[PDB]
Ligand binder design. Structure first.
Ligand SMILES: C[C@H]1O[C@H](O[C@H]2[C@H](O)[C@@H](O)[C@@H](O[C@H]3[C@H](O)[C@@H](O)[C@H](O)O[C@@H]3CO)O[C@@H]2CO)[C@H](O)[C@@H](O)[C@@H]1N[C@H]1C=C(CO)[C@@H](O[C@H]2O[C@H](CO)[C@@H](O[C@H]3O[C@H](CO)[C@@H](O[C@H]4O[C@H](CO)[C@@H](O[C@H]5O[C@H](C)[C@@H](N[C@H]6C=C(CO)[C@@H](O)[C@H](O)[C@H]6O)[C@H](O)[C@H]5O)[C@H](O)[C@H]4O)[C@H](O)[C@H]3O)[C@H](O)[C@H]2O)[C@H](O)[C@H]1O
Ligand SMILES: OC[C@H]1O[C@H](O[C@H]2[C@H](O)[C@@H](O)[C@@H](O)O[C@@H]2CO)[C@H](O)[C@@H](O)[C@@H]1O
Ligand SMILES: OC[C@H]1O[C@H](O[C@H]2[C@H](O)[C@@H](O)[C@@H](O)O[C@@H]2CO)[C@H](O)[C@@H](O)[C@@H]1O
Ligand SMILES: [Ca+2]
Ligand SMILES: [Ca+2]
Ligand SMILES: [Ca+2]
Ligand code: NA
Length: 481
């Protein structure tokens, strides 16, 4: 019954065009381990073959056309992708496609555009008069032609860029001039107006653009048979646009598409604003939780575990939180590097997978490892936790986040799941024990640690209490197995 999604990719995967095939053959395995949904990497053609996909060139080229010097994307061909999706569907796994609508990179040609420079630290302040720049805003898709879509992009479909091919100046942000041209609103306010991020910034004020992206969303959904979306860089996209784009796609497909937005800011208030402005119609990644987990793993035991959920989305708005430990941006060497340390990682996964609130996600990089950066596969430590979530994490939850090192919580289980119920106990410091209530109906049961970290057993007393133990800097998940 408990759902668990998996980000099926990491930044440094090899550019071998065999990822779709890997996913294909891993389908049955994932389902057996408790994975119920998979978030696939960008499926379209990037600025180059080895682009992870965020340098989004052509959203209609899913590794089907000869563009950018390659037919396949970094992950494989459209055929292989569709074969992987079918495999997932046949194994009862939902498929969430990534969605990049903030910008377009790898333009086919440049155009002469009138623009003014703006202050990178306050995009609402123009710092130069108007003049002509050479911007990469033209997309004709020579390898695709009009297949799937005849829509062509020009400078007027964008709000600006950060590169003038005619002068090649650094640290500049250009806001295009013209009828109705201005940064979109509402967007995040860091830097005054955070509409601009990278590449050619799409203008959500243009009717042709809104119409086109909505039509693409429908095409994308119907073509692959997607069950949901992972929406990229939403704090840089007109809030109402994303809200209405999701509503449009759900309506046009007659499907209640799941959606998780990436609003990257360690600030609950900003995320709450985003949720209210989008009418709570979709979920968001719990970025604050990720930082709490990260900071805890870097505090050498001095983090106050009692506050592990303070300021998080899962604590405040559990129904709209997608909890994750790490991702492709937080992994080593990447843009948002803040990788949760290996010793703490099992605790982090226990914190997201065994509690009743939030929609947890497993990171491919953590599960299978990141060989390029020395990160070992941790599936051996994650699998026992996934099994705990699948079979035992059910029923009423009792919290015991009452100590700076040792915290824990129990689940009383429900009749819908046999022998369900559990007692998670962890310590970011010295080991110990904690008495916790698991339910009077469990009296006499002899519980054991599904993680295997502790080898003994814990007998629930006549009143439903068990004295659970945990080793130092570790987590134990006691269950009636
Ligand atoms: C990654 C993350 O970033 C953002 O997060 C911010 C955050 O907003 C900010 O607040 C802060 O975060 C703090 C929090 O607020 C705090 O609360 C917390 O406590 O601390 C935080 C840490 O400070 O900082 C964060 C990081 O900055 C954003 O909000 C997140 O959403 C975002 N994560 C998601 C979003 C992504 C965007 O899709 C995605 O990013 C990925 O992938 C990106 C794309 O690869 C990558 O971007 C980087 O690399 C780009 C490519 O190098 C670079 O682009 C520039 O350079 C290009 C040239 O290479 C330019 O292109 C143009 O010029 C070229 C020449 C043209 N090419 C021509 C020429 C040719 C030569 O002959 C031809 O061959 C070609 O065919 C032609 O086309 C091209 O067409 C032109 O367009 C381009 O204009 C330049 O912008 C980017 O600038 C650079 O950033 C990211 O690194 C990577 O992470 C995330 O993965 C996704 O999860
Ligand atoms: O004269 C150039 C012209 O460019 C833009 O007009 C675009 C318009 O935005 C598109 O929707 C489409 O209709 O193509 C037009 C160009 O033929 C500017 O918006 C406009 O102000 C400008 O005059
Ligand atoms: O739709 C407006 C709605 O917003 C709030 O309700 C949120 C709630 O705060 C979230 O935690 C979650 O439960 O989603 C709800 C929206 O479905 C307000 O609390 C509510 O009064 C208001 O109607
Ligand atoms: Ca605009
Ligand atoms: Ca934008
Ligand atoms: Ca501590
Ligand atoms: Na814009």
């Amino acid at each position: 019954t408990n759902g668990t999604m998996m980000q099926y990719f990491e930044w440094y995967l090899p550019n071998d065009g065999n990822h779709w095939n890997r996913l294909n053959s891993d389908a049955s395995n994932l389902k057996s381990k408790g994975i119920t949904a998979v978030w696939i990497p960008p499926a379209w053609k990037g600025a180059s073959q080895n682009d992870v996909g965020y340098g989004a060139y052509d959203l209609y080229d899913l590794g089907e056309f000869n563009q950018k010097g390659t037919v396949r994307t970094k992950y494989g061909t459209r055929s292989q992708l569709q074969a992987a999706v079918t495999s997932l569907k046949n194994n009862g796994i939902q498929v969430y496609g990534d969605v990049v609508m903030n910008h377009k990179g790898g333009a086919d040609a440049t155009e002469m555009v009138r623009a003014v420079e703006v202050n990178p630290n306050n995009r609402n302040q123009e710092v130069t008069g108007e003049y002509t720049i050479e911007a990469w805003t033209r997309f004709d898709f020579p390898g695709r032609g009009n297949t799937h879509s005849s829509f062509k992009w020009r400078w007027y479909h964008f709000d600006g860029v950060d590169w003038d091919q005619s002068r090649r100046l650094n640290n500049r942000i250009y806001k295009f001039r013209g009828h109705g041209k201005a940064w979109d609103w509402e967007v995040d306010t860091e830097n005054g107006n955070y509409d601009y991020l990278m590449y050619a910034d799409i203008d959500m004020d243009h009717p042709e653009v809104v119409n086109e992206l909505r039509n693409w969303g429908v095409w994308y959904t119907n073509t692959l048979g997607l069950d949901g979306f992972r929406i990229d860089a939403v704090k840089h996209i007109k809030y109402s646009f994303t809200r209405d784009w999701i509503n449009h796609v759900r309506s046009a497909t007659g499907k209640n598409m799941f959606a998780v937005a990436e609003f990257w800011k360690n600030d609950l208030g900003a995320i709450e604003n985003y949720l209210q402005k989008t009418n709570w119609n979709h979920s968001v990644f719990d970025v604050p939780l990720h930082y709490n987990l990260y900071n805890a793993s870097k505090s050498g035991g001095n983090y106050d575990m009692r506050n592990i959920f303070n300021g998080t989305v899962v604590q405040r708005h559990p129904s709209h939180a997608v909890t994750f430990v790490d991702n492709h941006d937080s992994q080593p060497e990447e843009a948002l590097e803040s990788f949760v340390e290996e010793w703490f990682k099992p605790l982090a996964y226990a914190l997201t997978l065994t509690r009743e609130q939030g929609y947890p996600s497993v990171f491919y990089g953590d599960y299978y490892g990141i060989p390029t950066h020395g990160v070992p596969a941790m599936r051996s430590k994650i699998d026992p936790i996934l099994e705990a979530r699948q079979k035992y994490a059910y029923g009423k939850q009792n919290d015991y986040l009452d100590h700076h090192n040792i915290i824990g919580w129990t689940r009383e289980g429900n009749t819908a799941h046999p022998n369900s119920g559990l007692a998670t106990i962890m310590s970011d410091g010295a080991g110990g024990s904690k008495w916790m209530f698991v339910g009077r109906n469990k009296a006499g049961q002899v519980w054991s640690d599904i993680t295997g970290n502790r080898t003994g057993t814990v007998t629930i007393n006549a009143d439903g209490w068990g004295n659970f133990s945990v080793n130092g800097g570790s987590v134990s998940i006691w269950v009636n197995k």
